[PDB]
Write a protein that binds this DNA or RNA. Sequence first.
RNA 1: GAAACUGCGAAUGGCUCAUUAAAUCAGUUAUGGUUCCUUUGGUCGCUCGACUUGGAUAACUGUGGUAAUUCUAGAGCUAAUACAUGCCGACGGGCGCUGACCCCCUUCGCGGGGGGGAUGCGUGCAUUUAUCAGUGGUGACUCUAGAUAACCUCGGGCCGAUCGCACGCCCGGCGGCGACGACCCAUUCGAACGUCUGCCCUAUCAACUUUCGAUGGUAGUCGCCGUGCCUACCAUGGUGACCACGGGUGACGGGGAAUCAGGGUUCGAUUCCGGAGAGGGAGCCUGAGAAACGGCUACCACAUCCAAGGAAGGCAGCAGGCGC
Lengths: 262, 206, 100, 143, 37
Amino acid sequence: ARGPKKHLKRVAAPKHWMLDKLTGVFAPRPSTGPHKLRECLPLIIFLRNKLKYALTGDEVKKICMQRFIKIDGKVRADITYPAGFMDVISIDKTGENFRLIYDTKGRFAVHRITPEEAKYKLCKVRKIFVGTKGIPHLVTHDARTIRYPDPLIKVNDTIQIDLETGKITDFIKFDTGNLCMVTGGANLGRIGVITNRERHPGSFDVVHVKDANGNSFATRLSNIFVIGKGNKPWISLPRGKGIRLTIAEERDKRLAAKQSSG
Amino acid sequence: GISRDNWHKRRKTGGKRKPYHKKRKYELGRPAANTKIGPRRIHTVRVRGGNKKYRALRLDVGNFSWGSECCTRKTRIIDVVYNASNNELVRTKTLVKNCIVLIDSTPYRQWYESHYALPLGRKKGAKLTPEEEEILNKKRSKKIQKKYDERKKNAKISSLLEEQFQQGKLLACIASRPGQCGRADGYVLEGKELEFYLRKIKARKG
Amino acid sequence: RISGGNDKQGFPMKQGVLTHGRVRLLLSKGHSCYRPRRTGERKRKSVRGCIVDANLSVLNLVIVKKGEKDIPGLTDTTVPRRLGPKRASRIRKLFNLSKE
Amino acid sequence: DIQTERAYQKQPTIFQNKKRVKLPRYYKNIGLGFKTPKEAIEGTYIDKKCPFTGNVSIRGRILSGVVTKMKMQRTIVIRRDYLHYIRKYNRFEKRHKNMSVHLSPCFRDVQIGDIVTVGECRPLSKTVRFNVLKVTKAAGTKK
Amino acid sequence: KNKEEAAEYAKLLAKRMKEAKEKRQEQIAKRRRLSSL
RNA sequence: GAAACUGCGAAUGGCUCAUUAAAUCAGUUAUGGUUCCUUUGGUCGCUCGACUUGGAUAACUGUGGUAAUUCUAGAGCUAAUACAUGCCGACGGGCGCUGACCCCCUUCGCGGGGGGGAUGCGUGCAUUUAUCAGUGGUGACUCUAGAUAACCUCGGGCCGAUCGCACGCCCGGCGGCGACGACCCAUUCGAACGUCUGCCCUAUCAACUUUCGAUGGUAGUCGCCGUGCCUACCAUGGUGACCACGGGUGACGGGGAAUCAGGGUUCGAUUCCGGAGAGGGAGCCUGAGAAACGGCUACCACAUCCAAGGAAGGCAGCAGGCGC
């Protein structure tokens, strides 16, 4: 390497894209954007592989160059634009709106939302900051810089922003007894209520989360997103509601629905 | 060219490293600025990330600070006296960071007189005959004079400083890398620093 | 005026080299007798010296002052201006126009 | 006593020429529950590389060896012992790795055999990357 | 935009500082409570 | 709409394994010790002092050179988001010193207490230095903001002399979508140098390293930054039977592969990740990123074309030829 790399081989592509082997050598290396390369869903992948609207990368090119698809209330004419967590994908001509939040397993589900819910999103604040005139500053998980915020919002809270104005409406404080979706590690997509936070000065602080059915699991603080106050999520969830039942239970449910079909 | 790398020199144990790759660029290195005292001359070096880096090859002026009362003025460097690292950097008087220089005491004196309304240096029997110095030292209203008599209380200068002022040249220490920023900025020596360095200059001198 | 021709091997006379022989220069962008292919490219070019001498093949000459007599070849005619001013200020400057 | 080197030794943050009519000291607690010891606050020594009265931040690892040598200038060699486990023979082997570590004149008397806790800092010299943060006197050593 | 953002922050902040000052007088109320409960 | 100028890319991809034995590399952590084109989001009347400026060049036209190449000299013509040069605005003040002068109340009176305030100088962010105070944050800042006194590289930081669609809203009035550009900030892509532990055979390798850097201290230099990286002056140190130092490898490392009762032994040039190299060494231009080789400049080895003066090289890219 003598500079930045531009090709991403299909075997090196993040596993949650569920890309087949015998299609090609390469996968779409996501163009730089708000979310990380590893943890996004490129617009070509979501449009062609998941929705099956297009068949080839040229067909996706033909769609995205007619200004149809709108990511977070702005038109994105880049077929490998990184669409990541909490992002709101509205297609106007079809009349359909998707919020990219995780399946109960470590992948992105294709969760349809209503016109009135596809008008805002939840942003995890990353670092608070003072500018060049004692003007306070936020930085969120999706690279948004919000200045003149509410003077109580701190480094691990969640803010609800509007996708026209880009201004803070209401916020959920990071407390014990607040709903959190886990957005990294083994427990990727698990929804549960924060039970404890265990402080380790110099190391990564681990946070205990309780599922609805009394399933207790820990995650590092970085891989947690407060998505609701109490047991009330301020968004709509996929079918499953983030439980991640065992493989024996998933089998039982599968062949239950199978034998019921007959 | 001039390499700045660890792999060219022996391990902790005295064992030789065989270099596993040729010289890279980011392991860079350029010739020394060697800033002399003369008419302003600054060359520009384009560095990593496309940023700039100014090579002062000659300098006359410099932004020096009398620290005890926050009186900083652009003065004129005259010469160098003592350098802690090497004494050939005195002979071929190079301007490097933390070398002792002499500066023109005139802007500090001018401020001192215009602030306190008291004379500095100006030896006993000084013919102040232009007498706009007497304007700066006299002729006020009532309450303004009360403010000036209030202030002249705490204008007791250190004798070590007052000699240098009367001689007409002050000792200063260069606080900025002149070969990299193109500036000979510093602070005027005072107190225990000044007594330390005045001993060191006299002792070396002999 | 001696506008500067070529050597008898085609190595053109570069300005201000101040010799009567043939020498090698490392020519970069913004020079004579050279144009780079890539940006920041430099090249060794064999160029003939500036001093006009016996052993050339050509001399480029430009008629500084037109003399007493008239030549059959050149002065007789005059080629037209292919193009004129494209910039608004250059039009106003040439044809002497008021602002309004 | 101090100022043995040719350049004037001072804590460069504190200003010691304030006109008037004791010298002040700059220090810091370096986090992770380490008591900024008494000699740091009430000493008159100067050190760039003291974690208390200097410009080094402790971050990364916190290791511990036994003091082996104290024969170099404001630096000591600690000896770190561990058991490396060979897999074929279900047994261990006794290994060691001794590192040059920076000792502040803050810790006034350490004896070879004393137990040290070291915090990772930036590279201080060619081989020095760790700083002595607390000393625990070896078994007994009262008399 | 710079003027209106500054004005709306001045309202919201001054309200939050009045909340903290109501707490400041409870801090002194806790002092006098430890003094004479 | 050819050509040409400008902008971007050519640092990725591909090929091979010669080097290289705490090196590479793997897991684990650090940047509170750095640089970063592009993207996404902030900023961009925050500064108190022109209804559009300037002189060159290409393609083009024409005149030529030597045998020769992606060689190019000379003349005349013309452009810019190339290259330079620069207002007006908002703009009336505000703040900080300076400070004529002024009126007021008290001491009969001086003195005292506070008020207004002419003239002048300074002002924004970034940049370099010195001093003072302690809005938000960290396990911890010499952090971030704030205050005062100056600076400001002539090889020069910013503070739009730019382009396209829609055409509008009242008495020659009067503004929305975009493209392009930019000092700084965060973000994304990284890169870079560090932390801890880990490697094959060898004693017919037992001592090794250092006054021309070997291990440390102080102050510099240089670099994107931390550091003997390198200067100068000091100190006598660093490593070793727990195998240092030296030598060998038909040694690039790992994920892995073959064989297997349970242990294990052998392989891993080879499509994924990381590294190194472009015939052998060395040096650099341009750029955000190169010590680049389908870039340039030397020398060593080889080697093509010569009107004999000179010109041009680099298959461990895809095919293919000789040799082996």
